[PDB]
Design a protein around this nucleic acid. Structure first.
Ligand SMILES: [Mg+2]
Ligand SMILES: [Mg+2]
Ligand SMILES: [Mg+2]
Ligand SMILES: [Mg+2]
Ligand SMILES: [Mg+2]
Ligand SMILES: [Mg+2]
Ligand SMILES: [Mg+2]
Ligand SMILES: [Mg+2]
Ligand SMILES: [Mg+2]
Ligand SMILES: [Mg+2]
Ligand SMILES: [Mg+2]
Ligand SMILES: [Mg+2]
Ligand SMILES: [Mg+2]
Ligand SMILES: [Mg+2]
Ligand SMILES: [Mg+2]
Ligand SMILES: [Mg+2]
Ligand SMILES: [Mg+2]
Ligand SMILES: [Mg+2]
Ligand SMILES: [Mg+2]
Ligand SMILES: [Mg+2]
Ligand SMILES: [Zn+2]
Lengths: 60, 37, 213, 174, 146
RNA sequence: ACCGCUGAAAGCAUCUAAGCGGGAAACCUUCUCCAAGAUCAGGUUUCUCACCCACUUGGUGGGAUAAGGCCCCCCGCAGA
RNA sequence: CUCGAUGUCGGCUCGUCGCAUCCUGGGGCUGGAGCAGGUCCCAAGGGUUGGGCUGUUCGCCCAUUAAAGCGGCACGCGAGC
C-alpha cells in the first residue's frame, strides 16, 4: 500500500488490477519486489492499471 | 419569564418566536413572557 | 515604579507617636545596596535589577563569583538578589554602579517585607496545621495528638493528594503585606516598620514598596 | 420585497464598490461596509445601488434583504443623518452638558455622566429634552439605549429617561 | 525471510507543512503518517522510520466557529477538584501550537516508540521557522484518486 | 440568567439567521507560594580552559591535576 | 459476591464531592407605592453558632445569627479513637 501510493494508485485497485490481468504473485513477494526492485513494481502497477475497467464505479 | 416545557400564547398579541435555539413567547404584557426550559 | 532594598532584621522595640499611642516596630537595617546588574528585555527577556548587600571578605568569594563583580566594578558582597520590575521603563533610573540607601522610602509609606521564616523542625498536625486532636479523658487511648481519619473507605481506595499530615514546618519564603513605615533614620540606615517581619534576628530581608498601599 | 428594490443615490459622491466592499461620502462624513460574498451588489443605469443574489435558498433570501438596508443606511446615514429625540420625565430630574459629556440628576447620590463617544454629538434643547445625533444608525441607537436604561422602569410614577412619544405602561399604585 | 530494517538504513528528510486553510483533522493525520513512515515501503512497526515534520502557521488552522466556543480541553492535577478546562478558542489565543500538537499526539500509537517519534515534530504559530539550515521541502495534502 | 442595538427570511414585526453591546462572590488574569526530572531537562553571566602512560588505536583504558566541591574539624535560633 | 469472618448505631477526629441554594452575589414576574415579601431563573467562591433533654439519629426547646442548607462517599471514617 505504501509503494502503490508512490505510483498513484491505492492498494484497493491494485489487487483488482492484478486479479484482472492474471498475475498470481502473492503478497509475500509483491512486498519484496517493492523494496529490492522499485522499477519492476512500477511495471506491475501499469499492468494492473491497464486491466482495470474504464469506470470502476459502473456496475459489472 | 415563565419557565415551563409547554409554552403557548395567552392573548391576541402574544407572539411565539425562536431565538438562540429555544422557543419563547414575547408579548407586550410582561406577565405573558414565557420560554421553554 | 516599584522600589526595593535589602537589609537585616535587627529585632523589635517600641516607640510612641504624636497621639501618644504605642507603636510596635521592627528595626530593619536597610543597608547601602549597589546595583551590579540590570536585566533588559532585549538581552534577558524580562526587566529587573540586581541588588548586592552585605560586607564580606574578598578571600571568601570564589573565583567564578569574583569575575561577575569584576565586570560591574563592584567589590564583592555577601547577598545578591533581583528586584523584579514591570516591562515598561526598565532602568532609566538604575545604573550599574549606583549606590542605594535607606531614604528611598518616605515616612508614612507602605512596604511589602519578605524573608525566610523561622525553622520549626518536624511538626505534628496540631502545631503544623491547627488540628484539634482527640480528648484528654473519657477513655481515649493514646490518640491525644494523633490526626484521626485520613480518608474514606473502599471508595476511593486511596488518600487524596494534598492531605494535611505531619512534617517539616517553617524555613519558608513569607511575604507580609502593607506594613507602615513609621520612621526612616537616614543617619543609621534604619527603617522603623510597624509590626512583625518574618525571620530570625540577623536574617536577610527584602523591602519593596507596597502595591496595595 | 426588501432587497427587491434598487437603492437610489441622493447625493453619494463616491458610491463605489471596491471588490466586495462599499463606501459612501456626502455632506456629512464617510462610512464603510463589507457585504457577504454570496450576495451580489451592482449598479443601476445612473450608478445607483442594485442588490442581487443566487436565487431561492433559505440562507440567501435572508441575507439579501439584510444587505439591502445595510447599504441604504450608508447612503442615508450621511445625507439625512440619524437623530434620536429623548425626554427626561420625573420631578426634580434634569440633564445638562458638561463639555461634550452629558450629566444626569436622576435621584442618585451622584451625577451620572455619559461620555460621548467618537462620531456622536450630544445636545440639549431643554433641561428635560435632548438629542443623540450622528451618522451611523446602529451606533446612535446603541448610545440611546445606554442612556435609556439609566434608571429602572417605574410603572407607578413614570420617572426617568424615555424615548419621545413612547407609551410606557403604568400600574394602579397604592 | 522478509525485509527487516537494520540500524543504519533509515534516511530521514525534512518536510514543512503550511497550515493556513487546512482543517485540524486532515493536518494531524498527514503529519502523523509522515512522522511514522507509513508512506515508505520499508515500514516496520517497531522501527522509528519516518521524517521530520515542521508545521508553520499553526494559528491559521481551519477550526469551526462552534468548535472554538464549545469544544473543551481538560487537565487534571491529581488534587481533588483539579479538573481545569479551557476551550479551543482561548487556547488558540495563547498557545495555537499546542492545539495542533495535541491533535497529532492523539493519532500516534500508545507506546514507548511514539515518544521518540514525537521528538521530530516542530510546530510554530507564525509563518517563520528557525530550521533553514536544513532544506524542508513543502508538503501538500494529496488524495490518491480511486 | 437576564437586558438590548441594528436587521432579514416574512413590504409589518422580531436580541439573530450576517454582525455589535451591557452583564454576577462562579471561570481566566491580577495578589501570595511551589516550580526546568517542564527528558521540549530553558535563559543571562562568570571561572577553569590543562597534562601523562599503556594499547587490540577504540566517542578506548588508566594516572595526575585546574576552577570547584566533599569528608574531617569549631558551631548554629538549621536539624530525627 | 463474601459463612476456611466483608466488625454492625450514635458521637469524636479528619475530610472530600454533588446541587435539588440556607446566607452572601445577579436577574424576570408580581394581587411589586415604600420597607418588607411571594414565586421563578442563574450561581457551589467562601460561610453555615453555643447550649438544656435523650445512647440516640431525628425532634422539641433556650439564647443568638447575614444564615444556623440538603445529600453522596461500605447510612465516608473502630489495623484513627
Ligand atoms: Mg401550562
Ligand atoms: Mg445570550
Ligand atoms: Mg529546634
Ligand atoms: Mg484538647
Ligand atoms: Mg494501649
Ligand atoms: Mg493517655
Ligand atoms: Mg477501617
Ligand atoms: Mg524561585
Ligand atoms: Mg509535570
Ligand atoms: Mg540550566
Ligand atoms: Mg480468607
Ligand atoms: Mg459531607
Ligand atoms: Mg441551578
Ligand atoms: Mg426577586
Ligand atoms: Mg459551600
Ligand atoms: Mg475565583
Ligand atoms: Mg445539669
Ligand atoms: Mg458507616
Ligand atoms: Mg454520615
Ligand atoms: Mg464507630
Ligand atoms: Zn399577551
Amino acid at each position: 500500500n505504501a509503494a502503490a501510493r508512490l505510483n498513484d494508485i491505492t492498494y484497493n485497485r491494485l489487487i483488482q488490477g492484478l486479479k484482472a490481468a492474471g498475475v498470481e504473485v502473492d503478497r509475500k513477494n509483491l512486498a519484496d519486489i517493492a523494496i529490492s526492485d522499485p522499477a519492476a513494481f512500477t511495471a506491475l502497477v501499469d499492468v494492473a492499471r491497464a486491466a482495470l475497467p474504464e469506470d470502476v464505479n459502473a456496475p459489472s | 419569564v415563565k419557565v415551563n416545557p409547554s409554552v403557548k400564547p395567552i392573548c391576541d398579541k402574544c407572539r411565539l418566536i425562536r431565538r438562540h435555539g429555544r422557543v419563547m413567547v414575547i408579548c407586550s404584557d410582561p406577565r405573558h413572557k414565557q420560554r421553554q426550559g | 515604579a516599584r522600589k526595593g532594598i535589602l537589609g537585616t532584621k535587627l529585632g523589635m522595640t517600641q516607640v510612641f507617636d504624636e497621639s501618644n499611642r504605642v507603636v510596635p516596630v521592627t528595626v530593619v537595617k536597610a543597608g547601602p545596596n549597589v546595583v551590579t546588574r540590570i536585566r533588559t528585555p532585549e538581552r534577558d527577556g524580562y526587566s529587573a535589577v540586581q541588588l548586592a548587600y552585605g560586607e564580606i571578605s574578598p578571600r571568601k568569594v570564589n573565583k567564578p563569583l569574583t569575575g561577575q563583580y569584576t565586570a560591574a566594578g563592584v567589590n564583592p558582597r555577601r547577598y545578591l538578589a533581583e528586584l523584579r520590575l514591570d516591562d515598561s521603563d526598565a532602568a532609566t533610573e538604575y545604573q550599574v554602579g549606583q549606590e542605594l540607601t535607606a531614604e528611598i522610602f518616605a515616612d508614612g509609606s507602605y512596604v511589602d517585607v519578605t524573608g525566610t521564616s523561622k525553622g520549626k523542625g518536624f511538626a505534628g498536625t496540631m502545631k503544623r496545621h491547627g488540628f484539634r486532636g482527640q480528648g484528654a479523658s473519657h477513655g481515649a487511648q493514646a490518640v491525644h495528638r494523633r490526626p484521626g481519619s485520613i480518608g474514606g473507605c473502599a471508595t476511593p481506595a486511596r488518600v487524596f493528594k494534598g492531605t494535611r499530615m505531619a512534617g517539616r514546618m517553617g524555613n519558608d519564603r513569607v511575604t507580609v503585606l502593607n506594613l507602615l513605615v513609621h520612621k526612616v533614620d537616614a543617619e543609621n540606615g534604619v527603617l522603623l516598620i510597624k509590626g512583625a517581619v518574618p525571620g530570625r534576628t540577623g536574617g536577610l530581608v527584602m523591602v519593596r514598596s507596597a502595591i496595595k498601599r | 420585497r426588501i432587497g427587491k428594490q434598487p437603492i437610489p443615490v441622493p447625493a453619494g459622491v463616491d458610491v463605489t464598490i471596491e471588490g466586495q466592499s462599499i463606501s459612501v461620502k456626502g455632506p456629512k462624513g464617510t462610512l464603510g461596509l463589507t457585504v457577504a460574498e454570496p450576495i451580489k451588489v451592482a449598479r443601476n443605469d445612473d450608478g445607483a445601488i442594485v442588490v442581487t443574489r443566487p436565487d431561492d435558498e433559505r440562507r440567501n433570501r435572508s441575507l439579501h434583504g439584510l444587505s439591502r438596508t445595510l447599504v441604504s443606511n450608508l447612503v442615508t446615514g450621511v445625507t439625512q443623518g440619524y437623530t434620536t429625540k429623548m425626554e427626561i420625565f420625573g420631578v426634580g430630574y434634569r440633564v445638562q452638558l458638561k463639555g461634550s459629556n452629558l450629566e444626569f440628576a436622576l435621584g442618585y447620590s451622584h451625577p451620572v455622566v455619559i461620555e460621548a463617544p467618537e462620531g456622536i454629538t450630544f445636545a440639549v434643547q431643554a433641561p428635560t429634552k435632548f438629542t443623540v445625533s450622528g451618522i451611523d444608525k446602529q451606533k446612535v441607537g446603541q448610545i440611546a439605549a445606554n442612556i435609556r436604561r439609566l434608571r429602572r422602569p417605574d410603572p407607578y410614577k413614570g420617572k426617568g429617561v424615555r424615548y419621545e412619544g413612547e407609551q410606557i405602561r403604568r400600574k394602579v399604585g397604592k | 525471510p522478509t525485509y527487516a530494517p537494520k540500524a543504519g538504513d533509515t534516511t530521514r528528510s525534512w518536510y514543512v507543512i503550511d497550515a493556513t486553510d487546512v482543517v485540524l483533522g486532515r493536518l494531524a493525520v498527514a503529519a502523523a503518517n509522515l512522522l511514522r513512515g507509513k508512506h515508505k515501503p520499508t515500514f516496520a512497526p517497531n522501527v522509528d522510520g519516518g521524517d521530520f515534520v515542521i508545521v508553520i502557521n499553526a494559528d491559521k488552522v481551519a477550526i469551526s466557529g462552534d468548535k472554538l466556543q464549545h469544544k473543551m480541553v481538560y487537565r487534571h492535577s491529581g488534587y481533588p477538584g483539579g479538573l481545569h478546562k479551557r476551550t479551543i478558542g482561548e487556547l488558540m489565543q495563547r498557545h495555537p501550537d499546542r492545539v495542533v500538537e495535541k491533535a497529532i499526539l492523539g493519532m500516534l500509537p500508545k507506546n514507548r516508540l511514539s515518544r521518540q517519534i514525537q521528538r521530530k515534530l516542530r510546530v510554530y504559530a507564525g509563518p517563520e521557522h528557525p530550521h533553514s539550515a536544513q532544506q524542508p521541502v513543502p508538503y501538500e495534502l494529496k488524495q490518491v484518486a480511486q
